[PDB]
Symmetry: C2
Subunit: 42 residues, 2 copies
C-alpha cells in the first residue's frame, strides 16, 4: 500500500540504522563508562 | 650596659622563642609536606 519513496528508500535507511547501531553498540559504546575516568581521586 | 627591660625581659622572651621554635620545628612542622595531600590524582 506504500509508495516507492517509503517502500524501498525508507526501509533500506532503517536497515542501515539497525546495522550501524548493532556495530556501534557493543564496540564503540561498550567501554563508555568503564574507561570513563576523571582526574580527581574522589 | 643594657637596662633592666632588655637585660632580663627581652632575653627571657628570646629564650622562650628559641625553646618554642625547637619544640615546634621537628614535631609540628616535621610532616608539613609529607602529609600534605591533595584531592587530585594529578
Amino acid at each position: 500500500h506504500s509508495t516507492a519513496i517509503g517502500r524501498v528508500w525508507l526501509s533500506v535507511i532503517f536497515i542501515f540504522r539497525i546495522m550501524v547501531l548493532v556495530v556501534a553498540a557493543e564496540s564503540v559504546w561498550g567501554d563508555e563508562k568503564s574507561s570513563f575516568i576523571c582526574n580527581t581521586l574522589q
